[PDB]
């Protein structure tokens, strides 16, 4: 049974300790996944840090402790018991808590390449917003639309810790040449209101 | 610098096998031992087969034994997984690690130093697709514009996307694929650019789906 890995919310210059979560410590290794890589040695032998690791890491029994937490951070943390086989525990996913950052919001029509196809894509994005929480509304010619849309979400970011999301509303081109104003509305914290981002099918 | 390449990596249908490869470069291969480790979509890290470096000692992990065959030829500096009997649940991106050994009066203790890029393995009876590219045209906002390329309907994952042949990296965002109804991907990426610069500048998302052998390079430029 696959596990996804565990969430773990940390304020940068804060301290943040991992737990090995495996279900001396000589036998113990810590490694970190950034967003989109493979897994990278951190600690080995229980608390001796791999070259390049900044002072802030260190082991002890048996948890991961990173002194005060940075941006670059950011990721997936496993530990590793090096027995006769290995065995990798649950993962920590660290969230970094920055400041609240308003998402700016762009539309995107469906393209005269598309539409030849018989379908179309209209697509919202939003770029580099915190905190994760961020919701999406697809209005077509003022009605509210259910069912047809879906977004992802890219990793946090290692350098300013920010969320983008991109979600695109699908649509026959019959339909799609059937309405004219096309919006998606979007709520989130760093909004005091709601932000709007519409065209209207022609120009 | 020390490499760990993989390759083998594609769709398979369920029940059928597939083998992957991890070419070494860089380092003494022979005095080297071996794991496979394996990742599924949004999970964790689980430790799959280990050979030492004369082969002379192999094990498995109890999810794949019977099924999977780890080898290696050092005259070719190549590490082999045989998978047969595939899975659903053995969808995943599988990686090879190298093994660096400590040893004491008390015993002797190791960690992965090494490790490649990583290879996807799809078990699935679903047909390999290519995708269409269509351009994301920057809106006459001047400010900030974003503009982007739609890579739709593709079939294994994954795609690659880069802007500019890799010229441009700053402000874009490439996103994770979404399964559409149909059961292919699709997936966006997107850059913001200096709005005074829509004119002057060309960029192209330069699209690879290896899966299919497609590559695509659209131009994206603002409509009238």
């Given at each position: 049974m696959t596990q996804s890995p565990l969430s773990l919310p940390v304020t940068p210059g804060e301290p943040a300790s991992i737990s090995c979560r495996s279900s001396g410590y000589n036998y113990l290794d810590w490694y970190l996944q950034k967003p989109g890589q493979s897994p990278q040695l951190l600690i080995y032998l229980g608390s001796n840090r791999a070259s390049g690791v900044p002072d802030r890491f260190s082991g002890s029994g048996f948890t991961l402790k990173i002194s005060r937490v940075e941006a670059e951070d950011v990721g997936v943390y496993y530990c590793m018991q090096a027995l006769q086989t290995p065995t990798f525990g649950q993962g920590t996913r660290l969230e970094i808590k920055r400041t609240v950052a308003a998402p700016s919001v762009f539309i995107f029509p469906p393209s005269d390449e598309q539409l030849k196809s018989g379908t179309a894509s209209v697509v919202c994005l939003l770029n580099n917003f915190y905190p994760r929480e961020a919701?999406?509304?697809?209005?077509?010619?003022?009605?509210?639309?259910?069912?047809?849309?879906?977004?992802?979400?890219?990793?946090?970011?290692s350098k300013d810790s920010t969320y983008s999301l991109s979600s695109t509303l699908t649509l026959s081109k019959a339909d799609y040449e059937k309405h004219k104003v096309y919006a998606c509305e979007v709520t989130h914290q760093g909004l005091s209101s709601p932000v709007t981002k519409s065209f209207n099918r022609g120009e | 610098e020390?490499?760990?390449?993989?390759?083998?990596?594609?769709?398979?249908?369920?029940?059928?096998?597939?083998?992957?490869?991890?070419?070494?470069?860089?380092?003494?291969?022979?005095?080297?031992?071996?794991?496979?480790?394996?990742?599924?979509?949004?999970?964790?890290?689980?430790?799959?087969?280990?050979?030492?470096?004369?082969?002379?000692?192999?094990?498995?992990?109890?999810?794949?034994?019977?099924?999977?065959?780890?080898?290696?030829?050092?005259?070719?500096?190549?590490?082999?997984?045989?998978?047969?009997?595939?899975?659903?649940?053995?969808?995943?991106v599988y990686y090879?690690?190298?093994?660096?050994?400590?040893?004491?009066?008390?015993?002797?203790?190791?960690?992965?130093?090494?490790?490649?890029?990583?290879?996807?393995?799809?078990?699935?009876?679903?047909?390999?697709?290519?995708?269409?590219?269509?351009?994301?045209?920057?809106?006459?906002?001047?400010?900030?514009?974003?503009?982007?390329?739609?890579?739709?309907?593709?079939?294994?994952?994954?795609?690659?996307?880069?802007?500019?042949?890799?010229?441009?990296?700053?402000?874009?965002?490439?996103?994770?694929?979404?399964?559409?109804?149909?059961?292919?991907?699709?997936?966006?990426?997107?850059?913001?650019?200096?709005?005074?610069?829509?004119?002057?500048?060309?960029?192209?998302?330069?699209?690879?789906?290896?899966?299919?052998?497609?590559?695509?390079?659209?131009?994206?430029?603002?409509?009238?």
């Open positions: 919701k999406v509304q697809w209005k077509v010619d003022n009605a509210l639309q259910s069912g047809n849309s879906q977004e992802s979400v890219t990793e946090q970011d | 020390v490499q760990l390449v993989e390759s083998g990596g594609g769709l398979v249908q369920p029940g059928g096998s597939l083998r992957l490869s991890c070419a070494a470069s860089g380092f003494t291969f022979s005095s080297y031992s071996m794991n496979w480790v394996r990742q599924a979509p949004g999970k964790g890290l689980e430790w799959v087969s280990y050979i030492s470096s004369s082969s002379s000692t192999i094990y498995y992990a109890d999810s794949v034994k019977g099924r999977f065959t780890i080898s290696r030829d050092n005259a070719k500096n190549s590490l082999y997984l045989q998978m047969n009997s595939l899975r659903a649940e053995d969808t995943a090879c690690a190298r093994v660096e050994y400590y040893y004491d009066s008390s015993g002797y203790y190791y960690d992965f130093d090494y490790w490649g890029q990583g290879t996807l393995v799809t078990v699935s009876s679903a047909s390999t697709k290519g995708p269409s590219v269509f351009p994301l045209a920057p809106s006459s906002k001047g400010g900030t514009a974003a503009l982007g390329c739609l890579v739709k309907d593709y079939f294994p994952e994954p795609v690659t996307v880069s802007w500019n042949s890799g010229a441009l990296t700053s402000g874009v965002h490439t996103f994770p694929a979404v399964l559409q109804s149909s059961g292919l991907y699709s997936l966006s990426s997107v850059v913001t650019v200096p709005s005074s610069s829509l004119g002057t500048q060309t960029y192209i998302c330069n699209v690879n789906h290896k899966p299919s052998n497609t590559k695509v390079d659209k131009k994206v430029e603002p409509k009238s």
